[PDB]
Amino acid sequence: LRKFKLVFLGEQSVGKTSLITRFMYDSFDNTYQATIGIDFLSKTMYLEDRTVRLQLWDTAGQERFRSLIPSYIRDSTVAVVVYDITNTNSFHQTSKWIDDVRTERGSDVIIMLVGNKTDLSDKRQVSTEEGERKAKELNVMFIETSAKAGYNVKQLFRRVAAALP
Ligand SMILES: Nc1nc2c(ncn2[C@@H]2O[C@H](COP(=O)(O)OP(=O)(O)NP(=O)(O)O)[C@@H](O)[C@H]2O)c(=O)[nH]1
Ligand SMILES: [Mg+2]
């Protein structure tokens, strides 16, 4: 089968896992269950009217697990790097995650920068335009989402899939 190989990266608590579960299961939980190490989903699905093997690695944002991540980045055609629009540190820290992807794959990768939690726009600390500007500077795609609301979650996956050969 064709593969659709993604890795989710980003600081702790930004909503990596929640994006994945909203997409795959239409499921969201307010309760925080930290990802420990690297979790994995492999599923045969239909993409754009073809059978595709999804291989999705969901990494922990905690620094203590970061040493595990390079081999998973190496095997991933798509890297999804997530931040929380309410947390400026999480936004600036996307740089190291993108650098980690470049270290392993150079330009031979699709990267999507995601500003998540737009349902919390009252608490927004990073503008949409700041995100767009950073993405363009780094030569990566950009989207804003809300895993909680189910906003732009399917679109995230559609857009990275559309970039696959
Ligand atoms: N309001 C709101 N909360 C969200 C959103 N996405 C995730 N959360 C919340 O933020 C917390 C962390 O979410 P989670 O998906 O576990 O984040 P993660 O990036 O996978 N964390 P880790 O790196 O620890 O695995 C949870 O309490 C979850 O409910 C969102 O779009 N909006
Ligand atoms: Mg997680």
mmCIF file of C-alpha atoms and ligand atoms in Angstrom:
data_model
loop_
_atom_site.group_PDB
_atom_site.id
_atom_site.type_symbol
_atom_site.label_atom_id
_atom_site.label_comp_id
_atom_site.label_asym_id
_atom_site.label_seq_id
_atom_site.Cartn_x
_atom_site.Cartn_y
_atom_site.Cartn_z
ATOM 1 C CA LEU A 1 0.000 0.000 0.000
ATOM 2 C CA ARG A 2 0.691 3.660 -0.358
ATOM 3 C CA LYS A 3 1.631 5.055 3.019
ATOM 4 C CA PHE A 4 0.586 8.170 4.856
ATOM 5 C CA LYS A 5 3.321 8.521 7.501
ATOM 6 C CA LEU A 6 2.960 11.339 10.057
ATOM 7 C CA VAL A 7 4.663 12.337 13.284
ATOM 8 C CA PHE A 8 3.142 14.802 15.744
ATOM 9 C CA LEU A 9 5.598 17.047 17.575
ATOM 10 C CA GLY A 10 5.339 19.998 19.906
ATOM 11 C CA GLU A 11 5.566 21.194 23.481
ATOM 12 C CA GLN A 12 3.708 19.469 26.252
ATOM 13 C CA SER A 13 -0.059 20.118 26.482
ATOM 14 C CA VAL A 14 -0.486 21.896 23.124
ATOM 15 C CA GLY A 15 -3.059 19.353 21.896
ATOM 16 C CA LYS A 16 -1.160 16.863 19.680
ATOM 17 C CA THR A 17 -3.053 13.855 20.968
ATOM 18 C CA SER A 18 -6.371 15.694 20.985
ATOM 19 C CA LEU A 19 -5.977 16.628 17.310
ATOM 20 C CA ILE A 20 -5.319 13.001 16.422
ATOM 21 C CA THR A 21 -8.241 11.664 18.436
ATOM 22 C CA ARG A 22 -10.613 14.334 17.088
ATOM 23 C CA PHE A 23 -9.629 13.366 13.552
ATOM 24 C CA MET A 24 -9.628 9.596 13.966
ATOM 25 C CA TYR A 25 -12.500 9.034 16.393
ATOM 26 C CA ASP A 26 -14.316 12.388 16.639
ATOM 27 C CA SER A 27 -13.317 12.149 20.343
ATOM 28 C CA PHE A 28 -12.104 14.897 22.690
ATOM 29 C CA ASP A 29 -11.396 14.733 26.418
ATOM 30 C CA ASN A 30 -10.930 17.689 28.729
ATOM 31 C CA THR A 31 -8.951 15.432 31.013
ATOM 32 C CA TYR A 32 -5.197 15.522 30.335
ATOM 33 C CA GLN A 33 -3.581 12.141 29.714
ATOM 34 C CA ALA A 34 0.071 12.847 29.055
ATOM 35 C CA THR A 35 1.660 10.911 26.222
ATOM 36 C CA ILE A 36 4.372 8.674 27.572
ATOM 37 C CA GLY A 37 7.174 7.990 25.118
ATOM 38 C CA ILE A 38 5.789 7.555 21.621
ATOM 39 C CA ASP A 39 2.318 6.215 20.852
ATOM 40 C CA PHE A 40 1.353 4.723 17.508
ATOM 41 C CA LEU A 41 -1.683 4.155 15.331
ATOM 42 C CA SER A 42 -1.473 2.145 12.105
ATOM 43 C CA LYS A 43 -4.633 1.826 10.062
ATOM 44 C CA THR A 44 -5.584 0.937 6.530
ATOM 45 C CA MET A 45 -8.003 3.579 5.273
ATOM 46 C CA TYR A 46 -9.362 5.088 2.076
ATOM 47 C CA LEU A 47 -7.670 8.313 0.951
ATOM 48 C CA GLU A 48 -9.029 10.364 -1.812
ATOM 49 C CA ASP A 49 -10.667 7.162 -3.076
ATOM 50 C CA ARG A 50 -7.614 4.867 -2.689
ATOM 51 C CA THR A 51 -6.431 2.431 0.019
ATOM 52 C CA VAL A 52 -3.605 3.914 2.129
ATOM 53 C CA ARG A 53 -1.737 2.724 5.221
ATOM 54 C CA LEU A 54 -1.785 5.449 7.821
ATOM 55 C CA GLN A 55 1.229 5.271 10.206
ATOM 56 C CA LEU A 56 0.875 7.947 12.857
ATOM 57 C CA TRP A 57 3.395 8.503 15.639
ATOM 58 C CA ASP A 58 2.175 10.643 18.537
ATOM 59 C CA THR A 59 5.175 11.897 20.534
ATOM 60 C CA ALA A 60 5.380 13.237 24.065
ATOM 61 C CA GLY A 61 6.216 16.925 24.482
ATOM 62 C CA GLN A 62 8.081 16.340 27.726
ATOM 63 C CA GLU A 63 11.793 16.931 27.301
ATOM 64 C CA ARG A 64 12.645 13.632 29.051
ATOM 65 C CA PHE A 65 11.280 11.680 26.056
ATOM 66 C CA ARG A 66 12.854 13.835 23.344
ATOM 67 C CA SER A 67 15.830 11.462 22.759
ATOM 68 C CA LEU A 68 13.387 8.816 21.503
ATOM 69 C CA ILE A 69 12.022 10.950 18.693
ATOM 70 C CA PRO A 70 14.642 11.170 15.915
ATOM 71 C CA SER A 71 14.125 7.698 14.441
ATOM 72 C CA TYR A 72 10.384 8.313 14.205
ATOM 73 C CA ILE A 73 10.944 11.671 12.495
ATOM 74 C CA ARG A 74 13.318 9.900 10.091
ATOM 75 C CA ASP A 75 10.559 7.559 8.876
ATOM 76 C CA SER A 76 7.819 10.203 8.618
ATOM 77 C CA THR A 77 6.902 11.913 5.335
ATOM 78 C CA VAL A 78 4.798 14.446 7.234
ATOM 79 C CA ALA A 79 5.656 16.243 10.469
ATOM 80 C CA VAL A 80 2.860 18.109 12.247
ATOM 81 C CA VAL A 81 4.320 20.639 14.700
ATOM 82 C CA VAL A 82 1.770 22.010 17.126
ATOM 83 C CA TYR A 83 1.610 24.950 19.453
ATOM 84 C CA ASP A 84 -1.064 26.486 21.700
ATOM 85 C CA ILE A 85 -2.221 29.943 20.618
ATOM 86 C CA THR A 86 -2.623 30.894 24.294
ATOM 87 C CA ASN A 87 0.974 30.039 25.174
ATOM 88 C CA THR A 88 3.745 32.071 23.644
ATOM 89 C CA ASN A 89 6.502 29.754 24.894
ATOM 90 C CA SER A 90 4.898 26.862 23.035
ATOM 91 C CA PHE A 91 4.924 28.952 19.836
ATOM 92 C CA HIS A 92 8.546 29.968 19.983
ATOM 93 C CA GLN A 93 9.572 26.438 20.934
ATOM 94 C CA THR A 94 8.185 25.099 17.639
ATOM 95 C CA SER A 95 11.523 26.160 16.171
ATOM 96 C CA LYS A 96 13.434 23.370 17.844
ATOM 97 C CA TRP A 97 10.898 20.787 16.719
ATOM 98 C CA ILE A 98 11.101 22.022 13.107
ATOM 99 C CA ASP A 99 14.932 22.044 13.347
ATOM 100 C CA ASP A 100 14.754 18.410 14.608
ATOM 101 C CA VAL A 101 12.709 17.520 11.471
ATOM 102 C CA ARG A 102 15.170 19.331 9.166
ATOM 103 C CA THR A 103 18.105 17.532 10.841
ATOM 104 C CA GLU A 104 16.599 14.152 9.896
ATOM 105 C CA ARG A 105 14.890 14.871 6.545
ATOM 106 C CA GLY A 106 16.050 18.226 5.152
ATOM 107 C CA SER A 107 13.569 19.364 2.467
ATOM 108 C CA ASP A 108 12.331 15.798 1.872
ATOM 109 C CA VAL A 109 9.329 16.250 4.144
ATOM 110 C CA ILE A 110 5.962 17.975 4.451
ATOM 111 C CA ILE A 111 5.727 20.103 7.587
ATOM 112 C CA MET A 112 2.535 21.642 8.954
ATOM 113 C CA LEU A 113 2.744 24.249 11.750
ATOM 114 C CA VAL A 114 -0.490 24.217 13.762
ATOM 115 C CA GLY A 115 -1.777 26.902 16.118
ATOM 116 C CA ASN A 116 -4.239 24.918 18.242
ATOM 117 C CA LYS A 117 -6.878 25.913 20.832
ATOM 118 C CA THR A 118 -8.571 28.725 18.903
ATOM 119 C CA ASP A 119 -11.698 28.110 21.005
ATOM 120 C CA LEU A 120 -9.688 29.896 23.737
ATOM 121 C CA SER A 121 -9.345 33.043 21.658
ATOM 122 C CA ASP A 122 -10.073 35.188 24.711
ATOM 123 C CA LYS A 123 -6.716 33.882 25.966
ATOM 124 C CA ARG A 124 -4.891 34.244 22.646
ATOM 125 C CA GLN A 125 -1.287 35.443 22.941
ATOM 126 C CA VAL A 126 -0.055 34.615 19.426
ATOM 127 C CA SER A 127 -1.746 36.266 16.443
ATOM 128 C CA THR A 128 -2.759 34.278 13.369
ATOM 129 C CA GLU A 129 -0.398 36.478 11.408
ATOM 130 C CA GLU A 130 2.586 35.749 13.700
ATOM 131 C CA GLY A 131 1.977 32.058 12.993
ATOM 132 C CA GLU A 132 1.639 32.590 9.242
ATOM 133 C CA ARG A 133 4.856 34.636 9.222
ATOM 134 C CA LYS A 134 6.848 32.004 11.144
ATOM 135 C CA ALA A 135 5.554 29.219 8.856
ATOM 136 C CA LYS A 136 6.470 31.122 5.710
ATOM 137 C CA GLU A 137 9.959 31.987 7.105
ATOM 138 C CA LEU A 138 10.597 28.316 7.822
ATOM 139 C CA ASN A 139 9.111 27.041 4.571
ATOM 140 C CA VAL A 140 6.346 25.074 6.248
ATOM 141 C CA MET A 141 2.550 25.009 5.876
ATOM 142 C CA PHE A 142 0.319 26.718 8.447
ATOM 143 C CA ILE A 143 -3.129 26.198 9.929
ATOM 144 C CA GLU A 144 -5.052 27.148 13.071
ATOM 145 C CA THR A 145 -7.299 24.573 14.739
ATOM 146 C CA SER A 146 -9.449 23.776 17.686
ATOM 147 C CA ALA A 147 -9.375 20.123 18.627
ATOM 148 C CA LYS A 148 -12.039 20.849 21.281
ATOM 149 C CA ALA A 149 -14.427 22.526 18.838
ATOM 150 C CA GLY A 150 -13.563 20.219 15.915
ATOM 151 C CA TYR A 151 -12.455 23.191 13.804
ATOM 152 C CA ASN A 152 -9.974 22.699 10.968
ATOM 153 C CA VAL A 153 -8.994 19.249 12.221
ATOM 154 C CA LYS A 154 -10.054 17.373 9.118
ATOM 155 C CA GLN A 155 -8.619 20.222 7.063
ATOM 156 C CA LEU A 156 -5.218 19.734 8.729
ATOM 157 C CA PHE A 157 -5.156 16.123 7.562
ATOM 158 C CA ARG A 158 -6.616 16.891 4.129
ATOM 159 C CA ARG A 159 -3.993 19.528 3.396
ATOM 160 C CA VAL A 160 -0.992 17.395 4.351
ATOM 161 C CA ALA A 161 -2.453 14.441 2.435
ATOM 162 C CA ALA A 162 -2.902 16.646 -0.642
ATOM 163 C CA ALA A 163 0.829 17.381 -0.533
ATOM 164 C CA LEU A 164 1.729 13.625 -0.736
ATOM 165 C CA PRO A 165 2.903 12.172 -4.046
HETATM 166 N N1 LIG B 1 -9.666 24.356 25.099
HETATM 167 C C1 LIG B 1 -8.934 23.428 24.434
HETATM 168 N N2 LIG B 1 -8.255 22.543 25.136
HETATM 169 C C2 LIG B 1 -7.581 21.667 24.359
HETATM 170 C C3 LIG B 1 -7.491 21.618 22.970
HETATM 171 N N3 LIG B 1 -6.644 20.595 22.547
HETATM 172 C C4 LIG B 1 -6.299 20.025 23.672
HETATM 173 N N4 LIG B 1 -6.800 20.638 24.811
HETATM 174 C C5 LIG B 1 -6.551 20.272 26.195
HETATM 175 O O1 LIG B 1 -5.191 20.488 26.482
HETATM 176 C C6 LIG B 1 -4.692 19.429 27.338
HETATM 177 C C7 LIG B 1 -3.548 18.760 26.619
HETATM 178 O O2 LIG B 1 -4.044 18.099 25.474
HETATM 179 P P1 LIG B 1 -3.239 16.889 24.813
HETATM 180 O O3 LIG B 1 -3.961 16.557 23.574
HETATM 181 O O4 LIG B 1 -3.011 15.819 25.810
HETATM 182 O O5 LIG B 1 -1.841 17.561 24.518
HETATM 183 P P2 LIG B 1 -0.484 16.904 23.993
HETATM 184 O O6 LIG B 1 0.155 17.928 23.113
HETATM 185 O O7 LIG B 1 -0.821 15.590 23.345
HETATM 186 N N5 LIG B 1 0.392 16.711 25.349
HETATM 187 P P3 LIG B 1 1.689 15.727 25.609
HETATM 188 O O8 LIG B 1 2.867 16.368 24.936
HETATM 189 O O9 LIG B 1 1.854 15.732 27.085
HETATM 190 O O10 LIG B 1 1.299 14.404 25.059
HETATM 191 C C8 LIG B 1 -5.892 18.563 27.664
HETATM 192 O O11 LIG B 1 -6.437 18.987 28.940
HETATM 193 C C9 LIG B 1 -6.871 18.813 26.513
HETATM 194 O O12 LIG B 1 -8.239 18.673 26.846
HETATM 195 C C10 LIG B 1 -8.240 22.560 22.221
HETATM 196 O O13 LIG B 1 -8.320 22.669 20.994
HETATM 197 N N6 LIG B 1 -8.919 23.455 23.053
HETATM 198 MG MG MG B 2 -0.095 13.706 23.819
#
